[PDB]
Design a binder for this molecule. Structure first.
Ligand SMILES: *[C@@H]1O[C@H](CO)[C@@H](O[C@@H]2O[C@H](CO)[C@@H](O[C@@H]3O[C@H](CO[C@H]4O[C@H](CO)[C@@H](O)[C@H](O[C@H]5O[C@H](CO)[C@@H](O)[C@H](O)[C@@H]5O)[C@@H]4O)[C@@H](O)[C@H](O[C@H]4O[C@H](CO)[C@@H](O)[C@H](O)[C@@H]4O[C@H]4O[C@H](CO)[C@@H](O)[C@H](O)[C@@H]4O[C@H]4O[C@H](CO)[C@@H](O)[C@H](O)[C@@H]4O)[C@@H]3O)[C@H](O)[C@H]2NC(C)=O)[C@H](O)[C@H]1NC(C)=O
Ligand SMILES: *[C@@H]1O[C@H](CO)[C@@H](O[C@@H]2O[C@H](CO)[C@@H](O[C@@H]3O[C@H](CO[C@H]4O[C@H](CO)[C@@H](O)[C@H](O[C@H]5O[C@H](CO)[C@@H](O)[C@H](O)[C@@H]5O)[C@@H]4O)[C@@H](O)[C@H](O[C@H]4O[C@H](CO)[C@@H](O)[C@H](O)[C@@H]4O[C@H]4O[C@H](CO)[C@@H](O)[C@H](O)[C@@H]4O[C@H]4O[C@H](CO)[C@@H](O)[C@H](O)[C@@H]4O)[C@@H]3O)[C@H](O)[C@H]2NC(C)=O)[C@H](O)[C@H]1NC(C)=O
Ligand SMILES: *[C@@H]1O[C@H](CO)[C@@H](O[C@@H]2O[C@H](CO)[C@@H](O[C@@H]3O[C@H](CO)[C@@H](O)[C@H](O[C@H]4O[C@H](CO)[C@@H](O)[C@H](O)[C@@H]4O[C@H]4O[C@H](CO)[C@@H](O)[C@H](O)[C@@H]4O[C@H]4O[C@H](CO)[C@@H](O)[C@H](O)[C@@H]4O)[C@@H]3O)[C@H](O)[C@H]2NC(C)=O)[C@H](O)[C@H]1NC(C)=O
Ligand SMILES: *[C@@H]1O[C@H](CO)[C@@H](O[C@@H]2O[C@H](CO)[C@@H](O)[C@H](O)[C@H]2NC(C)=O)[C@H](O)[C@H]1NC(C)=O
Ligand SMILES: *[C@@H]1O[C@H](CO)[C@@H](O)[C@H](O)[C@H]1NC(C)=O
Ligand SMILES: *[C@@H]1O[C@H](CO)[C@@H](O)[C@H](O)[C@H]1NC(C)=O
Ligand SMILES: *[C@@H]1O[C@H](CO)[C@@H](O)[C@H](O)[C@H]1NC(C)=O
Ligand SMILES: *[C@@H]1O[C@H](CO)[C@@H](O)[C@H](O)[C@H]1NC(C)=O
Ligand SMILES: *[C@@H]1O[C@H](CO)[C@@H](O)[C@H](O)[C@H]1NC(C)=O
Ligand SMILES: *[C@@H]1O[C@H](CO)[C@@H](O)[C@H](O)[C@H]1NC(C)=O
Ligand SMILES: [Cl-]
Length: 968
C-alpha cells in the first residue's frame, strides 16, 4: 500500500514482483569506521551467496551532546550504504533508538540518566528525548530506501520489545505505534519488521495499534558457554518454530531477524577463539539447515562480522574485541571453516526458488528415512520440487548412521539408492536432499548429494554437487540421454538407463569427477573441494555485480579458486576476475562466455589454458613480500605523569563541583549529601576522577567509599600523595565497598582525597520499566569516620567538557578524564619535546598512572591486505594494572592485567597508516603500591593476503592542539 518495491505474502518477500529468500548477516558500521574496509566486508558477505546485511546505528555515538546530531566522517552512514550498493547487498536498517548490541547504554546516550521518565515507554520525557535522533537517522535511512534507488529494503523499529516490569503495562501499543510513526514521519515507506526476543507474538499483524508489517523474532539456541565448545545440550535444537509462526503471524513470511552466528565473551571469559569453536561449521550445517526445515524466508545471522569495541563504545560486561566468533573475523579474515560451510548453504538458497513455494510438513522419524535414528522434515512441492532436511534425531549425536530414503517424485515414489549401497550421515551433519529440482528446464528427479549451485550457459548447463568424505550418493535425471564420465576415473561410478531417466551412483572422492548427461555437466565434489568454489555475478554493463535479482543470479559464472573471489565482469574480449589469495592458487572458470578470449585477474593479463571440456585454467602465484614491523620496545618513548592530582601543588579550582543537592536520576535516590553520579554532570565515558576536600580534626582514622564502574571496574584512592589502596577489580563486582586506614592527620590542615574509577561503559536496558541503563557511575556512598558527610566537598571530572565533548572527529566516547586525555596528548604529535625518556616496559615504581608517547613509521607494500595486531605480554601472573592504547588518537585497546582475556588487539588499516607515521599513546595505571610495568609490547602480523582491495585512505587523525577549556 505505501510502496510496491518490497511486498510479501505468507511464503516470502517479493522484490519488484519476484520472490527472494533473504539471507543476511549482521554488520555494525560503528565497529569498523573505515569505509574501504566496509566495502571489503560487504564483498565477503556477497561471496557467501548472501543478499542482505542488517545493521544497528548507535545513538550514543551520534548524539553525545543532547540536541546535536552528528553522523559525519567516520560515523557517516552514506558511504556504508554506497558500499552495500556497490557490493550488491540489500540492507535491513535497525536504528533503535534502543539497540542493546553489547554496546554502552544499549545505544542510549548517558544523558538519558537525567530523563524523568521510564526508558522505552510512552512517558513524554523519554519520547521527547528520542525525537531529534530518530528524525535525523530515519531521514538518512529514508533517503537510501530501495524506493529511491538505494539498498535499504526493511526497517526495524525498537529492539526486542519483549519484556516489561515495574508498573509498565507491557506491551504498550501507544508506545510502539509512536516509535513506528517516528520512522514513517521521516519518510520511511518500506516494511517495518520487529525482532521479538522470543516467539511471543508481540506487535504481530492483527494485534491492532502498534503492529509491524512483518513479525520477526530472534533465536540463540546453542547459548553462550564458549568454555565447553563441544557440548550441545539436550533440547537446544528448535523444533516448533513453524508451528509457532502459523499461530502468531501466518500471513507474513517466516523471519528470524537475529539467528545466532557466534557469541559474546565477557571480561575474564575464555576468549572469542573458543566462541568460534562453539559456533563452528558443524553448528552451522545442523542449526541453519534446521531453520530451512521451517521454510525460513528472512534469515539474518548475528553477527557475520563483529569488529571492535573501540573508543569505549562497548557495554561494561564486554571488552575491546567483538570478534564474536563470527564467519568473518575481527581482523576481516575468512579462514574459519564456518565461512566456507556457510557459503555452501548461501549458494544453495540463491538458486533454489522451489524452496519458497513448497509446502512444509511436520518433522518425521519414519516414512522418508528407514531409521528412527534420523529425523526428516519434508518441504513438498508438486511441479516446483521438494526438499528433505535430514539430521540425527538426537541432534548432538556424533554417530555414523547408514540409511535409505523413500522419496516422492513426479516420476513416482522411489527407494534410494536404487543401484545398491546406502547413504551415510556422519555425526553432527545435516543434508538437504532434493527431488524434481529444476536446472533451467532439466529436471533432476532426485539428488542425495547437496546442491552448491547450477547455471545455464550458452554452450550447456552445469550443476555442482557435493558430499562429505566416505559418503555414497545417487542422482537421477529426466532424460533419454546416457551418462558419460568426461573428467576423472570411472571407478565407483555406476549407472542405469530407464525409459525416461538415467540413474547415476557415485562415491565421494577428493578427486573431482565430471559427468555429462545430454547438455548438462555435473561436478561431483567432496565438501572440502566445494569450499574452494565461488559463484560471482558476471556484470556485462560496468564492473559492479548488482543486487541478487533473478536475471543477475542467472548470469553468474562458476570459479574454483582459493581464499576469495569478489567479482567478475565481461568487457570486450576480456573476462575480468577480482579475487584475493593467501597461497599459490589454481584458478578454474566454468561458463566462460563465448566472446571471451583473454583472462584478467585483479586487472592483470593472465595466461590461461582451455581443457577438452571448455574449462579455463590459470595459476596465480603467491610470494609474500617482506613485512618490516618496528620493534615497539626500541622506540623513543616519552613519559609524563598523568596523575598530577596527587601532588600537593595541584590546583583543581576549575574542576566542576559535585555539589548538586538533587539527582536527576530516577533509578537511585542519593545516599550522599550531593550527587556523585558522573552522568548528573555530563560525564559518561572513560576514567573518572573525584577530589574530596576536607579540613582535618586530627582524630581521623578511616575513610570508607563505595565506588561503582560496572563489571570488572577498578578504583584507586589517595589522601594527598599518600596511597590508601585500590579495588583491583573482578568481573563479579560492578561496585565495591572499601574501608581505608588513614595516616595521622594534622588538626586544621586541608586534605584532598583523590579517587580514580574505571568506567566500563553504561548498562543495557533489556527489560522495559527496569531502567537499568540509568545505573550510575561514580561514588555511591562514603564515610569519613567521626565526621559528617558534609565535611567533604567534592569535585569531579570525566572527559573534558562532558557532553560538550572536545573531539568531534573521533566521537563522544573515545577519551576519558585523565590529565593527558583532557589535554589531548593522546593525539598525533603531542608536545613531548621536554618530557622524560621512559618506556611503559620500565613503568612505575609506585601506585599511579603514567602516560607514554612514541611514533613509528610503516612502509608496507601496496596490493597486500596485511592484518596488524598490538600485543601486550602476559606470560606470567601479573601485578594488577590497567592499560589503554590510543593509535593515532583512536582508543583501540583496553587491558586489565589481572582479569583479561585479551592480549592481542587488531588495529585496522585506515586507523594505522601503512605508508606513513603512526602514533601510540599508552596509559599505564598501576593499582599496586609497588607500581607496575608491561612485560612486553609488540606489533605483529598474520598471513599477508594478495588483495584486489583498492587503497585504504587514512581516516581523519586530528593532531594535538592546546585546549583552552582544560583545567591548567
Ligand atoms: C584471522 O583472524 C583472527 C582474529 O582476528 C586471528 O586470530 C587471532 O590471532 C592472533 C595471532 O595468532 C592470536 O593471538 C595469539 O594467540 C596465541 C595463543 O593462541 C594459540 O594457542 C592457544 C593455546 O595453545 C590455542 O588454543 C589457540 O588455538 C585456537 O585459536 C586459534 C586462533 O588463534 C585457532 O586457529 C585454533 O583452531 C584454536 O581455536 C592458538 O593456537 C599467543 O601465543 C600469541 O602470543 C604470542 O605471539 C605474539 C605475536 O603474535 C607475541 O606478541 C606474544 O608475546 C606471544 O609470543 C610468544 O609466545 C609464542 C608461543 O609460546 C612464541 O612462539 C613467541 O616466540 C613468543 O615467545 C616469547 O615469549 C614467551 C612467553 O609467552 C616465552 O615463553 C618465550 O621464551 C619467548 O620469550 C598471540 O596472543 C589471537 O588470540 C587470535 N584471536 C582470536 C579471536 O582467535 C587469526 O590469526 C587470523 N588468521 C589469519 C590467517 O590472518
Ligand atoms: C588461507 O585461507 C584458507 C581459507 O580459504 C585457510 O584454509 C582454512 O584453514 C582453516 C584452519 O585455519 C581450516 O579449518 C580447520 O580445518 C582443520 C582440518 O580439517 C578440515 O579438513 C580436513 C581435510 O583436510 C577434513 O577431514 C576435516 O573434516 C573433519 O573435521 C571437521 C572439523 O572438525 C568436521 O566438521 C568434519 O565433519 C570432519 O570430521 C576438516 O574439514 C580442522 O582440523 C580444524 O578444526 C579444528 O579447529 C576448529 C577451530 O579453528 C574447530 O572448530 C574444530 O572443532 C577443530 O578443533 C580442534 O582443533 C583446535 C586447534 O586448532 C582445538 O582448539 C580444538 O580443541 C580441537 O582439538 C581437539 O579435537 C581434535 C579433533 O578435531 C583433536 O585431534 C585434538 O587433539 C583436540 O582434542 C579447522 O576446521 C579450513 O578447513 C581451511 N579452509 C579451506 C577452504 O581450505 C588457510 O589456513 C589460509 N592459510 C594461511 C597460511 O593463512
Ligand atoms: C594474565 O594471566 C593471569 C594468570 O593466568 C590471568 O589471571 C586469571 O584470570 C582469570 C580470568 O579472569 C581468573 O579466573 C576467574 O576467577 C574468578 C574467581 O575470582 C571467577 O569468578 C571467574 O569465573 C567466572 O567468570 C568468568 C568471566 O569472567 C566466566 O567465564 C566463568 O564461567 C565464571 O562465571 C561465573 O561468575 C560470573 C561472575 O559472577 C557470572 O557472570 C557467571 O554467570 C558465572 O556465575 C555462576 O558461577 C558463579 C561461581 O563461579 C556463581 O557465583 C553464580 O551464582 C553462577 O552460578 C574466572 O574463573 C583467574 O582467577 C586469574 N588467575 C590468577 C592466578 O590470578 C589474567 O586474566 C591474564 N590476563 C590477560 C590479559 O589475559
Ligand atoms: C594536601 O594537599 C593540599 C592541596 O591539594 C594542600 O593545600 C595547600 O595548603 C597550603 C597551606 O598549608 C596553602 O597555602 C595552599 O594554597 C594549598 N594548596 C592548594 C593547591 O590548595 C595541603 O597543604 C596538603 N596537606 C598537607 C597536610 O600537606
Ligand atoms: C503437525 O504438527 C502440528 C503441531 O503439533 C499438529 O497440530 C498437526 O496435527 C500435525 N499435522 C499432521 C498432518 O500430522
Ligand atoms: C524451470 O525453469 C524454466 C526456465 O529456467 C522455467 O521456464 C520453468 O517454468 C521451470 N519449471 C518449473 C516446473 O518450475
Ligand atoms: C551407457 O553408458 C554406459 C557407460 O557409462 C555403457 O555401459 C552403456 O553401454 C551405454 N548405453 C548405450 C545404449 O550405449
Ligand atoms: C521527577 O518528577 C517528579 C514530578 O515532577 C518529581 O517529584 C521528582 O522529584 C523528579 N525526579 C527526579 C529524579 O528528577
Ligand atoms: C577521637 O577518636 C577516639 C577513637 O575513636 C575517640 O575515643 C574519641 O571520642 C575521639 N574524640 C572526639 C573529641 O570525638
Ligand atoms: C556496598 O554497601 C552497600 C550499602 O550497604 C550495599 O547496598 C552494596 O550491595 C554493597 N556492595 C557490594 C559489592 O557488596
Ligand atoms: Cl587538565
Amino acid at each position: 500500500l505505501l510502496q510496491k518495491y518490497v511486498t510479501w505474502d505468507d511464503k516470502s518477500l517479493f522484490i519488484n514482483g519476484e520472490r527472494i529468500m533473504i539471507f543476511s548477516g549482521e554488520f555494525h558500521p560503528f565497529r569498523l569506521p573505515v569505509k574501504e574496509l566496509q566495502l571489503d566486508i560487504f564483498q565477503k558477505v556477497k561471496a557467501l551467496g548472501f543478499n542482505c546485511v542488517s545493521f544497528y546505528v548507535d545513538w550514543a555515538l551520534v548524539e553525545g551532546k543532547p540536541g546535536e546530531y552528528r553522523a559525519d566522517g567516520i560515523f557517516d552512514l552514506e558511504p556504508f550504504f554506497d558500499a552495500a550498493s556497490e557490493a550488491g547487498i540489500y540492507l535491513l536498517a535497525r536504528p533503535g533508538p534502543y539497540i542493546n548490541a553489547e554496546s554502552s547504554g544499549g545505544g542510549f546516550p548517558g544523558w538519558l540518566q537525567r530523563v524523568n521518565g521510564t526508558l522505552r515507554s510512552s512517558d513524554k520525557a523519554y519520547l521527547d528525548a528520542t525525537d531529534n535522533y530518530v528524525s535525523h537517522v530515519a531521514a538518512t535511512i529514508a533517503k537510501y530506501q530501495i524506493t529511491n534507488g538505494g539498498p535499504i529494503i526493511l526497517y526495524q523499529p525498537e529492539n526486542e520489545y519483549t519484556s516489561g516490569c515495574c508498573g509498565v503495562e507491557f506491551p504498550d501499543p501507544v508506545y510502539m505505534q509512536y516509535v513506528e510513526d517516528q520512522a514513517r514521519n521521516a519518510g520511511v515507506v518500506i516494511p517495518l519488521i520487529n525482532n521479538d526476543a522470543s516467539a511471543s507474538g508481540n506487535n504481530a499483524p492483527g494485534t491492532g495499534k502498534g503492529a509491524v508489517d512483518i513479525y520477526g523474532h530472534d533465536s540463540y539456541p546453542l547459548g553462550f558457554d564458549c568454555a565447553n565448545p563441544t557440548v550441545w545440550p539436550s533440547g537446544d535444537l528448535p523444533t516448533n518454530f513453524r508451528t509457532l509462526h502459523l499461530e502468531q503471524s501466518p500471513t507474513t513470511p517466516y523471519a528470524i531477524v537475529e539467528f545466532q552466528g557466534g557469541s559474546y565473551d565477557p571480561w575474564g571469559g575464555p576468549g572469542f577463539a573458543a566462541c568460534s569453536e562453539l559456533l563452528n561449521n558443524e553448528f552451522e550445517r545442523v542449526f541453519y539447515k534446521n531453520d530451512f526445515s521451517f521454510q525460513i524466508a528472512i534469515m539474518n545471522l548475528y553477527m557475520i562480522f563483529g569488529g571492535t569495541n573501540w573508543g569505549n563504545l562497548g557495554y561494561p560486561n564486554g571488552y575491546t574485541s567483538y570478534d564474536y566468533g563470527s564467519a568473518v573475523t575481527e581482523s576481516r579474515n575468512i579462514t574459519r571453516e564456518k565461512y566456507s560451510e556457510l557459503k555452501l548453504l548461501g549458494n544453495f538458497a540463491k538458486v533454489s526458488p522451489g524452496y519458497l513455494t513448497a509446502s512444509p510438513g511436520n518433522l518425521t522419524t519414519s516414512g522418508y528415512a528407514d531409521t528412527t535414528d534420523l529425523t526428516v522434515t519434508p518441504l513438498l512441492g508438486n511441479s516446483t520440487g521438494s526438499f528433505f532436511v535430514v539430521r540425527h534425531s538426537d541432534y548432538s549425536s556424533e554417530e555414523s548412521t547408514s540409511y535409505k530414503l523413500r522419496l516422492p517424485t513426479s516420476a513416482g515414489s522411489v527407494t534410494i539408492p536404487q543401484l545398491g549401497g546406502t547413504l551415510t550421515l556422519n555425526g553432527r551433519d545435516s543434508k538437504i536432499h532434493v527431488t524434481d529440482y529444476n536446472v533451467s528446464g532439466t529436471n533432476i528427479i532426485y539428488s542425495t548429494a547437496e546442491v552448491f549451485t547450477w547455471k545455464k550457459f550458452a554452450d550447456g548447463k552445469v550443476l555442482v554437487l557435493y558430499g562429505g568424505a566416505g559418503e555414497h550418493h545417487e542422482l537421477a535425471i529426466s532424460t533419454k540421454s546416457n551418462v558419460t564420465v568426461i573428467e576423472g576415473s570411472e571407478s565407483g561410478i555406476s549407472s542405469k538407463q530407464t525409459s525416461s531417466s538415467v540413474v547415476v551412483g557415485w562415491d565421494v572422492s577428493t578427486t573431482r569427477r565430471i559427468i555429462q548427461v545430454g547438455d548438462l555437466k555435473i561436478l561431483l565434489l567432496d565438501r572440502n573441494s566445494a569450499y574452494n568454489y565461488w559463484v560471482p555475478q558476471l556484470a556485462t554493463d560496468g564492473t559492479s555485480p548488482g543486487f541478487s535479482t533473478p536475471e543477475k543470479v542467472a548470469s553468474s559464472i562458476i570459479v574454483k579458486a582459493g581464499y576469495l573471489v569478489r567479482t567478475a565482469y565481461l568487457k570486450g574480449s576480456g573476462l575480468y576476475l577480482t579475487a584475493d589469495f593467501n597461497a599459490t592458487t589454481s584458478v578454474e572458470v566454468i561458463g566462460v562466455p563465448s566472446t571471451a578470449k583473454n583472462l584478467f585477474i585483479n586487472g592483470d593479463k593472465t595466461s590461461h589454458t582451455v581443457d577438452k571440456n571448455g574449462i579455463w585454467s590459470a595459476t596465480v602465484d603467491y610470494n609474500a613480500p617482506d613485512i618490516s614491523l618496528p620493534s615497539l620496545k626500541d622506540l623513543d618513548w616519552k613519559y609524563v605523569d598523568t596523575l598530577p592530582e596527587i601532588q600537593s601543588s595541584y590546583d583543581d579550582s576549575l574542576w566542576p563541583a559535585a555539589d548538586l543537592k538533587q539527582t536527576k536520576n530516577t533509578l537511585r535516590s542519593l545516599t550522599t549529601p550531593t550527587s556523585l553520579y558522573s552522568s548528573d554532570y555530563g560525564f559518561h565515558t572513560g576514567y573518572l576522577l573525584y577530589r574530596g576536600h576536607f579540613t582535618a580534626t586530627g582524630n581521623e582514622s578511616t575513610f570508607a567509599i563505595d565506588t561503582q564502574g560496572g563489571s570488572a571496574f577498578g578504583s584507586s584512592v589517595w589522601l594527598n600523595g599518600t596511597y590508601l589502596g585500590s579495588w583491583t577489580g573482578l568481573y563479579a563486582n560492578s561496585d565495591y565497598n572499601a574501608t581505608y586506614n588513614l595516616p595521622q592527620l594534622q588538626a586544621g590542615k586541608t586534605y584532598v582525597i583523590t579517587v580514580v574509577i574505571d568506567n566500563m561503559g553504561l548498562e543495557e536496558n533489556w527489560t522495559v520499566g527496569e531502567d537499568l541503563m540509568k545505573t550510575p557511575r561514580g561514588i555511591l556512598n562514603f564515610l569519613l569516620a567521626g565526621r559528617p558527610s558534609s565535611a567533604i566537598s567534592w569535585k569531579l571530572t570525566g572527559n573534558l567538557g562532558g557532553e560538550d565533548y572536545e573531539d568531534k572527529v573521533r566521537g563522544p566516547l573515545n577519551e576519558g578524564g585523565l590529565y593527558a586525555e583532557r589535554q589531548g596528548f593522546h593525539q598525533p604529535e603531542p608536545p613531548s619535546q621536554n618530557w622524560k625518556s621512559s618506556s611503559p616496559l620500565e613503568g612505575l615504581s609506585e601506585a599511579g598512572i603514567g602516560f607514554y608517547s612514541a611514533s613509528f613509521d610503516l612502509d608496507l607494500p601496496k596490493g597486500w591486505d596485511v592484518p596488524l595486531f598490538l600485543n601486550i605480554g602476559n606470560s606470567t601472573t601479573p601485578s594488577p594494572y590497567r592499560v589503554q592504547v590510543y593509535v593515532n588518537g583512536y582508543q583501540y585497546a583496553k587491558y586489565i592485567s589481572n582479569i583479561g582475556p585479551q592480549t592481542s588487539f587488531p588495529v585496522p588499516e585506515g586507523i594505522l597508516n601503512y605508508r606513513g607515521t603512526n602514533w601510540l599513546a599508552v596509559t599505564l595505571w598501576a593499582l599496586d603500591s609497588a607500581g607496575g610495568k608491561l612485560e612486553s609490547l609488540e606489533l605483529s602480523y598474520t598471513t599477508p593476503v594478495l588483495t584486489a582491495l583498492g587503497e585504504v585512505e587514512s581516516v581523519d587523525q586530528p593532531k594535538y592542539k592546546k585546549r583552552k577549556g582544560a583545567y591548567h
